[PDB]
Design a protein around this ligand. Structure first.
Ligand SMILES: [Ca+2]
Ligand SMILES: [Ca+2]
Ligand SMILES: [Ca+2]
Length: 314
């Protein structure tokens, strides 16, 4: 379901030779870097990284970092991190400094699996002073902080069996926690949307629509505002259709005269080996133009080339 897969006939020491020749000497051969790194799975880029340092006793990442610049550099460095460590540094930068990149925290914590999130916690603690949870608490507050802490446990019910008796009970509780009352009990939404299984919550959304005649997402928009609202919707959307969710975030990152380059880079890189094919399909059905098309119009240069290389893949 991804666009980038293992390149066949693989030799990392040779790809390291390709990259050395592309950087050695005056000037830079940006096309050879893209043809190589962009056409290798992430695990293969790690072998290349180890072969590069073995052969020449230089740090590949350090050399690319000084050889390249701009958003083309950022895409390459993002490609060179492992899926877990790329997630780890994206969360760090989102919390870094003043302000918060809540959308990034939401995008990651709402889409990744239990197993992956458990690995984020270990990696975040290993790499940084704080734990993932302590990092969250510092930068978020209210019921939104609880939402991220809940998702950051990687403990969603992994069952696929649905009990309609409990589905209907969950629907009634959601109706009572928001739409059918003055005010909102955000905690009831949190516990149901974060702890219940995906097969269970999909049935809840369909049953909730049947009984109330309204989609759960509209109740959320009616009951909640701010980051808590965007968080809940992201969770529901990912439970429904994770590809369609990312396709929408991509579309919002490009529409306008400007571009959300951090988001654009993160999504293309982070989903390239998971479901970027499905994203592309969802993108075409929802907006008419292809994801490939909108990228060419919003980016340029080597930055666009590597992005499109990821879109097409292999
Ligand atoms: Ca050079
Ligand atoms: Ca209400
Ligand atoms: Ca609202």
């Amino acid at each position: 379901r991804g666009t980038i897969t293992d390149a066949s006939g693989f030799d990392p020491l040779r790809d390291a030779e390709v990259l050395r020749k592309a950087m050695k000497g005056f000037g830079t051969d940006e096309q050879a870097i893209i043809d190589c790194l962009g056409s290798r799975s992430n695990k293969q880029r790690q072998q290349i990284l180890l072969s590069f340092k073995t052969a020449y006793g230089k740090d590949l990442i350090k050399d690319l970092k000084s050889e390249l610049s701009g958003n083309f550099e950022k895409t390459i460095l993002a490609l060179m991190k492992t899926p877990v460590l790329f997630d780890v540094y994206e969360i760090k930068e989102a919390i870094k400094g003043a302000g918060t990149d809540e959308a990034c925290l939401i995008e990651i914590l709402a889409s990744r699996s239990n197993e992956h999130i458990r690995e984020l916690n270990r990696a975040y603690k290993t790499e940084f002073k704080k734990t993932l949870e302590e990092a969250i608490r510092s930068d978020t507050s209210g019921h939104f902080q609880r939402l991220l802490i809940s998702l950051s446990q990687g403990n969603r019910d992994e069952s696929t069996n649905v009990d309609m008796s409990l589905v209907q009970r969950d629907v009634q509780e959601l109706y009572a926690a928001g739409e059918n009352r003055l005010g909102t009990d955000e905690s009831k939404f949190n516990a149901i949307l974060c702890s219940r299984s995906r097969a269970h919550l999909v049935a809840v959304f369909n049953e909730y629509q049947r009984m109330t005649g309204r989609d759960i997402e509209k109740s959320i928009c009616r009951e909640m505002s701010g980051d808590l609202e965007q968080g809940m919707l992201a969770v529901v959307k990912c439970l429904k259709n994770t590809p369609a969710f990312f396709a929408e975030r991509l579309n919002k990152a490009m529409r306008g005269a400007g571009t959300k380059d951090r988001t654009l880079i993160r999504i293309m890189v982070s989903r390239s080996e998971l479901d970027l094919l499905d994203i592309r399909a969802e993108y075409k059905r929802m907006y008419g133009k292809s994801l490939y098309h909108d990228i060419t119009g919003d980016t340029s240069g080597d930055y666009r080339k590597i992005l499109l290389k990821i879109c097409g893949g292999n």
